[PDB]
Design a protein around this nucleic acid. Structure first.
Lengths: 69, 90, 212, 100, 443, 870, 208
RNA sequence: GAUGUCAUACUUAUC
């Protein structure tokens, strides 16, 4: 009720798997954008810099798994 | 506003046996008119008494101003009267 | 030696026994805690030290039974039967990309040198006696309460972010006693019943014996 | 508190106003209601401490005497990083005993 | 067994970098944050090298750090956010040689989550407020005040949260003796997640929202909100008041848009790419830093793209409105996370992959023979701006700080036939990679 | 009923032997119904006879019948009726429940307890009847309307909570549609109650949710009554939510600026009161909010006189600190003459408004002290310092605040020279107000400005006020203590003159005079050690050592408090009443049945055990430890917290070998508040002394075949672990088989105690490498989360929150795995709650501990960023 | 809409974790993926019962307490039992007279013995893994043997003394194993006297 | 195993 409205990503008993997967992907993107080690590993894995990787992580926050079902 | 545990009668435990009726009437009559006072005259009920007042507020003020009163060399206690606790010996 | 340590990128590292007569490779030891380790390093014949991409570094210790004679369907919980345990885990803040147990200085002792992706270099050294380890733990517990970090985060909650700490003494909090106020250092020495030059010598001797 | 399940907290934005405790609830925690090993003080909100509500008790609501603080079990469990632990509504607690 | 972990070599890969008068003298100082370590360097113009004066361990993950100066003061305080939910405002003490924590305001839980603030930290140019915004649906604004004992005090944090709205970046608009304004490129994810058709996720571009914190009402409300035709990556505030065109430009993939509201129109300018480089088949180029500078004559921005072409952009505006935005390729630089342009001609680039550089500005502006472009030029067929590559001619390298942060590979070997062993590791990413052998001896 | 006279037979039948004298019953066991309440329960006197003549509404008569158990029945019967009506509120319906509750609460022969029980039954049936009382919103609002304007604060708070619950349950449209014809009513009290209910609904449902409706109600020009009701609702919303109004100030100010311009003076007075209230709340310092409002207010205050001018002056005095320094200096220079001219006003409301504005008119710079002492303070002393102002509390507290503001602004000596003449008056209320003002002046400013020509007169006035006290108020003793603390070393030729008065007042026929003398000796006990007075304190202690024979227990408790203050202000082993002749003297004094006297005796016993434990021969402590078990089970919450500390001090002094056996023997009592106190005392004794010596003995009390003794031993072990914390790493292996065997018991209380002990061991040994015992206890605590009791569920949630912080969030996510998509919803809801608690505890730690999910056909869930390796 | 258990077993890669109640849930594939994970824990068996996991051991006999060796090696349990036996025989007058003048020194054993038992004589308990849950019948199911080895109880019931000489230490069923041959279910089983040396293989069986 | 009346007992340092 109020816990799902105050803190997003908690869930309830009628939560589907797609919303939980989208919340887990958003939490993983926030942990990658927050921690410097994950951003450095993502910048060393590809040829892009830290700003391009941060823009690609911020642009993928809107529906990271796809359309809902 | 009064709790339901208070009543018109109040019990006293560990009372001196050498106390007269005039001293008990003076100690019980300080908070109001005392209707009746019964002292125990039994070896199994020695040191206990029951003082019933005419007013409920006067009985509550007497029970609030007698718990731990200075007496002879014993530790007297004043408590409220209970129907289930007074007939525990039977 | 007659075994393989297959490090997986998602679950853990699993041990496999190799036979001389046959040619099969049946896994008989795995871990239950998810770590997602990137690299690993072998220290002894039983334990194995690994480092994750999140920033933590753990050491999976083998059980004393070590039933490796398994010839070959359910296991314990969708895996093998002999589940390994962990005895040491510490979060450093950066993803450790290389780890090697060697001797950086001649005449000292063996230590695990680790290189992360943030440019830093760490050195993990074991404890010789229990009294020095208890003194280091008391100094760390005194420095975590008397000298809080500037970022506002707790020192106990920093190494226990992803994996909980177990028998891990943070040397960066113990080496900060020589850069604090003299009154706080004197109070920490009086709480431990020692001298601040003696505490500085005890903090510097282990660092001089373990590394440069 | 933990004794009355009908008690609700404010859960607002905690400012710079430090919480206060009365003489009857001095030393007790706000959430765990423990009087052993204090770790961190309580931060009140702006609406819970304004005008006549400044320097009052967070649990009971009377005049404050000492400073309010949380126990050691709440600082390690990340219970002090929540909103203001101020009791606003008093339901089925210290209300029927005054009328009886 | 009980082990103990010590740090032999400190972290050299700098994640964040700022500059300012932290000591309180006329000279400037650089503050670097490598995630878990905070260092202070003194860019001395006599020798040109960089010397570290203090290095502390924050025992966390510093996501943002910014130096801000109060109104009528000489020393600048550093406000930093970590993985915990507390912003720490500290001041460097030259006498004690340590970072004394002046204030610590807790407004969230620990851990690098999207609800805990600490990701984006913006400060006003005047020094009256500070905005801390998280990744999504969390924002706060603290008001800094000056107590009469020359003290810095923090008021109660305001509430400016908006549900189902993610924030990529935030900055503070310059306002001389006015209410502080915070501009952020917000993105609504409600319609993109409520529509299962998938077409709503393509028309959900970011919009610039400027919220003006009212000091008289003690609250924060969204003043203006303007949509954008492209997804913005970063924001750069321009100095204003008695200076000139106060605003906040937005950077995007081959795009720089000045979108100062009220009366000025949105002026867009494509980023000048290379001449004949075969490095972008269908990809664009976005900016990585701003590096604003002002030598008490005008204002300039040393922008850096994804390739590394450092460009000095200067905006020629009118007395009240903005006329056009001009830019030109200044020099070539390695890829750095943040650049700190200091006074007396000094530019410090802290590369996240490779070594850090500290150069001296010899020819500022360089508007003599360079083919500079402008936003008011009627150019068609895409960007139509092909800049030619050239070596470093306006700046000369003075200091090169070795930063082998990318030590992915590391082996301890004694192949040099010496007594003490050596360590062969790797550094850099891409073309700046190098095999480095390190020994315990001195140079 | 309780004050009815009884006969001799009823008095003799209620006394045991061995004492010397010195149809009207509805359906059986229903309680006695009142003769005036035979209208609502008229269908209960006849038999039911349910045989094809029972409609559904007759079951609503059962809803009346439980109401017969709820109005004047037994409190267990009332609790059973409340439990039957709360769990069956959805099946009975809100319709007949409201139709039976509405004439019962509107009876003219009701009481306070019956109205409180009806309000509690309406609030308890409001959580299950959500979105169903929308036709019954007006019938509840008409009954909850006089509850907010009641005299008692608890009934007003209950009415405000009921109004907030009705606004949260009925939404915003139904409350706006129900209160819409209640604004233009002819009754002014009903309109004020409707405005207060609308303000409570706007405070409970948000300010912009009711802001355009209030703007349309205030902007409509049809009658002055609707505008007055809207202004009163705005004033009540500004006075209820100060912080909430501040943001809405700009809006609220734009609606309040339209008023105070019509021909009706009542609407202008209501608008001025709303602006004053707004200034107090909305935009507390928002001068701009009052900008467009400061221009007609000065014109209305200068062009007219009366109640509207007084309201405009009150609004100007409330908005004057909310402006700048120059604006306040310009406003104070033009409002001092209007305040001096209104000092001779015969109206009490205008005088109260002037006294409230005089405290805010001089609170900053701009107003000089000489002009305030010459032309403002003599009319304030001649027009406000009367005898009628001390009768009302609102007229006395505001006058005391104005006097404190005048003493803080002008000076404390000029107020002390004029307030000392009223200390020896013939009125008790005026003398108490003067003593409170003198105490406030001594606490805020101090006594440094008082010279030697007024301090003796103030001390004589304080002595005359303390010696001629007729009530039981502690204001005079606190004022004398504050005056003694402000004097300090200046009261050195005053200690014999106070001691000769205290010794004379200690021996009197009254009982409250000795208690007042003992309270004055206790309040002035700290001023004797700082003035180099050691013989007088010893003489007072020797007098109070023999003053324990006062028959009044309120005087004996005050004498014990004075003895404790004399023992705290002086040395423990340097007292002329020494500890060798006082600790046996207090051993029969600790057996008192009072609350404050027993608390003072327990505090004195704890102080004698902490500071004077070497003054006994180790024999009286073992006898007093057995009497300390009878000092608990008291409804005071003060002696039970000191008895555990006294038992811990006795166990630290005499050794933890004798008190532990008594604490184990007193654990089997089968009484409430007697087993938890002994367990807390045993935990305090184990935390003060060595916890290992009480380690096997705590394993012995679980060996006895008893549930209460095992529960008390588990509670003592949990409290000892919570008091130890980091010291419990060595006592975890000894408590691990006891916690493993206690969790497998059939009793849920023992499982809850084992879960609490496991949570204490997890929160105490977090970060020490003790994750094996936590993972072993989590395997047994995991079937304990499916219980139906809320206490066991809360204990399991606390154990899970401890194990997620001790063993790590990864083990908590692995234990809660495969339960979010469970088929059974009763376990899926608990798994979702555990996942939400683990996410609120540590959200960033769940990224690396997240399981691998395969990608679907339309959507992808595989994390490609973390799966890559360099 | 709700598929059967056969399609859920054929679609999932691990059909052993598929149950009959999981087919009527809101997500069969997600439940099959969560139940067949690496570190996932199964649901308890008391979620579908009707006794709330506490009404099974009603009349079953249970011991009061199992004291460890470190607590029993201090002599506190015998002293507590002696004090409980001495206090149970006292009347109300003997209990009331001991409250005014108590007798000090109840046991008075030692002061450093408890610290030596809790610090030096500390023994680690028998813990378990986090995946092994607890049930109602887990305390009574202790049956959860090797070919070629015999326990002491089986040798006492069968009457076969285990000795180093292989004359009588193998069971008398070894004559049938010598007359018929080795068992076909264990080709690597080695018994002394037939395919193993008698003084070397004294364990009466070897799995090589 | 559910239901509705009565009784006993337990817990949350409740007052």
């Amino acid at each position: 009720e109020h816990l799902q409205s105050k803190y997003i990503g908690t869930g309830h008993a009628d939560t589907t798997k797609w919303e939980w997967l989208v919340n887990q992907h958003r939490d993983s993107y926030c942990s990658y954008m927050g921690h410097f080690d994950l951003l450095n590993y993502f910048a060393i894995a590809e040829n892009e810099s830290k700003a391009r990787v941060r823009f690609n992580l911020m642009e993928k926050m809107l529906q990271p798994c796809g359309p809902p079902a | 506003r009064l709790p339901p545990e208070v009543n018109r009668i109040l019990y006293i435990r560990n009372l001196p046996y050498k106390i007269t009726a005039e001293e008990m009437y003076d100690i019980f009559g300080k908070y109001g008119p005392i209707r009746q006072i019964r002292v125990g005259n039994t070896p199994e009920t020695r040191g206990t008494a029951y003082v019933v007042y005419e007013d409920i507020f006067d009985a509550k003020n007497a029970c609030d101003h007698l718990s731990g009163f200075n007496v002879c060399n014993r530790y007297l206690v004043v408590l409220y009267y209970n129907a289930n606790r007074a007939f525990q010996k039977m | 030696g007659h075994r393989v340590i297959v490090s997986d990128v998602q679950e853990s590292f699993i041990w496999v026994r190799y036979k001389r007569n046959e040619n099969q490779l049946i896994i008989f030891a795995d871990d239950t805690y998810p770590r997602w380790v990137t690299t690993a390093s072998l220290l002894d014949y039983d334990t194995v030290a690994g480092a994750d991409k999140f920033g933590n570094i753990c050491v999976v210790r083998l059980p004393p039974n070590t039933n490796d004679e398994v010839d070959e369907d359910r296991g314990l919980l969708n895996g093998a039967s002999q589940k390994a345990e962990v005895i040491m885990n510490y979060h450093v803040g950066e993803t450790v990309l290389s780890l090697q147990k060697t001797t950086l200085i001649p005449g000292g002792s063996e230590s695990l040198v680790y290189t992360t992706l943030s440019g830093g270099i760490g050195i993990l050294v074991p404890f010789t006696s229990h009294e020095d380890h208890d003194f280091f733990q008391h100094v760390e517990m005194h420095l975590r309460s008397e000298h809080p970090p500037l970022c506002g985060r707790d020192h106990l909650s920093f190494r226990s972010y992803y994996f909980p700490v177990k028998n891990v003494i943070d040397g960066d909090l113990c080496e900060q006693f020589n850069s604090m106020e003299p009154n706080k250092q004197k109070n920490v020495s009086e709480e431990l019943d020692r001298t601040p030059p003696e505490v500085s010598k005890k903090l510097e001797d282990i660092r001089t014996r373990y590394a440069f | 508190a933990k004794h009355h399940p009908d008690l609700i907290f404010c859960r607002k934005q905690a400012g710079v106003a430090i919480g206060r405790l009365c003489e009857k609830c001095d030393g007790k925690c706000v959430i765990c209601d423990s009087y052993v090993r204090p770790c961190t003080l309580v931060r009140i909100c702006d609406e819970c401490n304004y005008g006549s509500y400044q320097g009052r008790c967070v649990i009971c609501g009377g005049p404050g005497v000492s400073d309010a603080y949380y126990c050691k079990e709440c600082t390690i469990q990340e219970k002090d990083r929540d909103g203001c632990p101020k009791i606003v509504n008093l339901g089925s607690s210290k209300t029927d005993l005054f009328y009886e | 067994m009980f082990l103990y972990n010590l740090t032999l070599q400190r972290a050299t890969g700098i994640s964040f970098a700022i500059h300012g008068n932290f000591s309180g003298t006329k000279q400037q100082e650089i503050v670097v944050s490598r995630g878990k370590i905070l260092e202070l360097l003194r860019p001395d113009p006599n020798t040109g090298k960089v010397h570290t004066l203090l290095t502390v361990e924050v025992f966390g993950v510093i996501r943002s750090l910014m130096a801000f100066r109060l109104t009528g003061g000489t020393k600048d305080y550093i406000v930093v956010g970590s993985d915990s939910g507390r912003i720490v405002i500290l001041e460097y003490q030259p006498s004690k040689n340590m970072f004394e924590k002046i204030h610590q305001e807790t407004f969230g839980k620990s851990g690098c989550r999207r609800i805990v603030p600490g990701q984006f930290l913006a400060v006003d140019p005047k020094g009256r407020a500070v905005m801390i915004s998280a990744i999504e649906k969390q924002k706060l604004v603290y008001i800094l005040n000056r107590d009469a004992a020359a003290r810095l005090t923090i008021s109660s944090p305001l509430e400016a949260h908006k549900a189902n709205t993610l924030v990529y970046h935030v900055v503070g608009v310059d306002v001389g003796f006015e209410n502080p304004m915070f501009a952020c490129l917000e993105m609504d994810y409600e319609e993109a997640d409520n529509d299962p058709t998938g077409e709503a996720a393509a028309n959900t571009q970011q919009t610039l929202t400027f919220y003006e914190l009212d000091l008289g009402l003690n609250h924060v409300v969204r003043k203006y909100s303007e949509p954008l035709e492209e997804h913005g990556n970063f924001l750069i505030t321009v100095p204003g008041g008695s200076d000139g065109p106060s605003g906040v430009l937005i950077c995007s993939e081959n795009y720089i848009t000045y979108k100062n509201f009220g009366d000025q129109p949105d002026i867009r300018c494509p980023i000048p790419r290379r001449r004949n480089d075969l490095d972008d088949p269908e990809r664009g180029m976005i900016f990585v830093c701003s590096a604003t500078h002002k030598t008490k004559s005008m204002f300039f921005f040393l922008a850096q793209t994804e390739q590394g072409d450092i460009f000095k952009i200067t905006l020629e505006t009118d007395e009240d409105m903005v006329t056009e935005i001009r830019l030109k390729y200044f020099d070539t630089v390695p890829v750095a996370a943040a650049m700190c342009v200091l006074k007396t001609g000094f530019l410090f680039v802290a590369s996240e992959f490779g070594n850090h550089y500290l150069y001296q500005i010899a020819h500022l502006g360089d508007d003599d023979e360079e083919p500079e472009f402008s936003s008011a030029m009627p150019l068609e067929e895409g960007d139509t701006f092909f800049f030619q590559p050239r070596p470093l001619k306006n700046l000369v390298l003075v200091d090169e700080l070795d930063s082998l942060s990318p030590i992915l590979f590391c082996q301890i070997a004694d192949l040099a036939n010496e007594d003490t062993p050596q360590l062969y590791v790797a550094c850099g990413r891409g073309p700046r990679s190098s095999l480095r052998v390190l020994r315990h001896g001195l140079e | 009923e309780r004050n009815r006279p009884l006969s001799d037979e009823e008095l003799d039948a209620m006394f045991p032997e061995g004492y010397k004298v010195l149809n009207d019953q509805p359906s059986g066991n229903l309680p006695f119904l009142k003769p005036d309440d035979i209208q609502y329960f008229d269908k209960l006197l006849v038999d039911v006879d349910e045989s094809t003549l029972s409609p559904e509404e007759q079951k609503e008569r059962k809803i009346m019948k439980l109401l017969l158990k709820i109005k004047n029945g037994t409190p267990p019967m009332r609790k059973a009726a409340l439990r039957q009506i709360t769990d069956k509120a959805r099946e009975f319906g809100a319709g007949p429940l409201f139709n039976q509750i509405l004439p019962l609460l509107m009876s003219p022969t009701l009481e306070d307890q019956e109205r409180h029980l009806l309000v509690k039954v309406i609030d308890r049936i409001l959580y299950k009847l959500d979105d169903l009382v929308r036709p019954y919103v007006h019938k509840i609002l008409v009954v909850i309307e006089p509850l907010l304007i009641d005299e008692d604060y608890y009934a007003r708070v209950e009415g405000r909570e009921i109004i907030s619950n009705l606004a949260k349950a009925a939404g915003l449209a139904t409350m706006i549609s129900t209160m819409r014809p209640d604004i233009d009513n002819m009754d002014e009290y009903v309109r004020n109650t409707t405005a207060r209910a609308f303000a409570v609904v706007a405070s409970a449902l948000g300010i912009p949710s009711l802001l355009p409706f209030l703007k349309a109600v205030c902007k409509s020009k049809k009658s002055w009554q609707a505008r007055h009701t809207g202004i009163k609702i705005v004033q009540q919303i500004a006075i209820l939510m100060g912080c909430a109004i501040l943001p809405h100030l700009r809006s609220l100010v734009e609606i309040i600026e339209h008023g105070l311009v019509d021909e009706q003076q009542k609407v202008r007075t209501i608008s001025a009161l709303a602006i004053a209230a707004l200034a107090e709340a909305a935009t507390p310092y928002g001068i701009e909010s009052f900008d467009s409002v400061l221009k007609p207010l000065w014109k209305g205050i200068r062009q007219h006189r009366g109640k509207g001018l007084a309201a405009f002056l009150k609004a100007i005095g409330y908005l004057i600190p909310l402006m700048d320094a120059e604006y306040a200096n310009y406003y104070t220079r033009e409002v001092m003459l209007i305040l001096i001219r209104e000092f001779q006003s015969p109206d009490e409301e205008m005088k109260k408004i002037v006294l409230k504005v005089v405290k805010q008119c001089c609170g900053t710079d701009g107003v000089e002290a000489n002009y305030i002492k010459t032309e403002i303070l003599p009319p304030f002393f001649k027009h406000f310092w009367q005898h009628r102002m001390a009768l009302d509390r609102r007229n006395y507290r505001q006058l005391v605040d104005t006097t404190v503001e005048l003493a803080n602004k002008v000076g404390a000596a000029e107020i002390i020279s004029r307030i000392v003449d009223d200390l020896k008056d013939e009125a008790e209320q005026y003398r108490k107000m003067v003593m409170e003002t003198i105490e406030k002046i001594m606490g805020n400013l101090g006594a440094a400005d008082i010279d030697h020509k007024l301090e003796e007169q103030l001390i004589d006035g304080i002595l005359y006020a303390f010696q001629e006290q007729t009530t039981e108020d502690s204001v005079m003793l606190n004022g004398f203590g504050t005056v003694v603390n402000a004097l300090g070393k200046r009261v050195k030729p005053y200690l014999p003159q106070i001691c000769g008065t205290v010794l004379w007042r200690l021996n009197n026929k009254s009982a409250k005079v000795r208690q007042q003398a003992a309270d004055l000796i206790s309040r002035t006990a700290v001023v004797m050690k700082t003035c180099q007075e050691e013989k007088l304190m010893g003489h007072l202690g020797v007098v109070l050592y023999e003053y324990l024979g006062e028959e009044y227990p309120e005087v004996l408790g005050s004498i014990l408090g004075a003895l404790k203050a004399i023992v705290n202000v002086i040395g423990m082993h340097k007292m002329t009443p020494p500890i060798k002749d006082l600790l046996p003297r207090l051993t029969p004094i600790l057996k008192n049945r009072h609350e404050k006297v027993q608390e003072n005796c327990i505090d004195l016993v704890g102080r004698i055990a902490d500071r004077g434990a070497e003054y006994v021969s180790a024999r009286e402590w073992m006898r007093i430890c057995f009497e300390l078990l009878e000092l608990l089970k008291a409804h005071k919450k003060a002696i039970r917290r000191a008895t555990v500390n006294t038992f811990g001090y006795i166990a630290k002094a005499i050794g933890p070998h004798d008190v532990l056996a008594t604490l184990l023997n007193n654990l089997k009592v089968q009484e409430r508040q007697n087993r938890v106190c002994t367990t807390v005392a045993i935990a305090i004794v184990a935390e003060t002394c060595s916890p290992f010596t009480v380690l096997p003995a705590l394993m012995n009390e679980y060996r006895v075949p008893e549930l209460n003794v095992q529960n008390g031993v588990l509670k003592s072990l949990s409290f000892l672990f919570e008091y130890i914390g980091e010291m419990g790493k060595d006592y975890i292996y000894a408590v691990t088989p006891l916690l493993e065997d206690a969790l497998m018991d059939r009793d849920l209380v023992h499982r809850q105690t084992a879960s609490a002990v496991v949570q204490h061991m997890s929160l105490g040994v977090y970060g020490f490498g003790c994750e094996d015992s936590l993972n072993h206890l989590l395997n047994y605590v995991w079937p304990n989360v499916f219980e139906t009791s809320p206490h066991v569920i809360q204990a399991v949630m606390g154990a899970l929150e401890g194990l997620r912080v001790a063993i790590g969030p990864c083990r908590m996510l692995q234990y809660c795995l495969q339960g979010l998509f469970h088929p059974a919803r009763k376990v899926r809801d608990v798994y979702w709650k555990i996942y939400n608690s683990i996410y609120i505890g540590s959200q960033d730690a769940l990224i690396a501990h997240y399981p691998r999910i395969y990608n679907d056909d339309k959507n992808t869930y595989i994390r490609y960023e973390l799966d890559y390796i360099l | 809409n709700r598929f059967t258990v056969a399609e859920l077993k054929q679609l999932v890669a691990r059909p052993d974790v598929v149950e009959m109640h999981d087919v009527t849930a809101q997500d069969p594939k997600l439940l099959v993926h969560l139940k067949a994970t690496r570190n996932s824990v199964p649901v308890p068996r008391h979620w579908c019962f009707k006794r709330k996991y506490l009404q099974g051991k009603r009349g079953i006999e249970k011991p009061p307490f199992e004291l460890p060796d470190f607590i029993k090696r201090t002599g506190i349990q015998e002293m507590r039992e002696a004090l409980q036996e001495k206090e149970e025989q006292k009347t109300m007058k003997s209990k009331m007279r001991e409250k005014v003048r108590p007798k000090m020194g109840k046991i008075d054993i030692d002061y450093q013995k408890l610290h030596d038992a809790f610090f030096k004589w500390q023994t680690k308990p028998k813990l378990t893994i986090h995946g092994d849950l607890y049930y109602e019948g887990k305390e009574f199911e202790t049956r959860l043997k090797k070919p070629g080895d015999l326990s002491d109880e089986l040798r006492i019931s069968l009457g076969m003394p285990v000795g180093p000489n292989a004359h009588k230490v193998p069971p008398p069923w070894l004559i049938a194993m010598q007359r018929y041959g080795p068992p076909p279910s264990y080709p690597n089983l080695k018994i002394p006297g037939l395919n193993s040396p008698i003084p070397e293989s004294c364990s009466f069986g070897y799995h090589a």
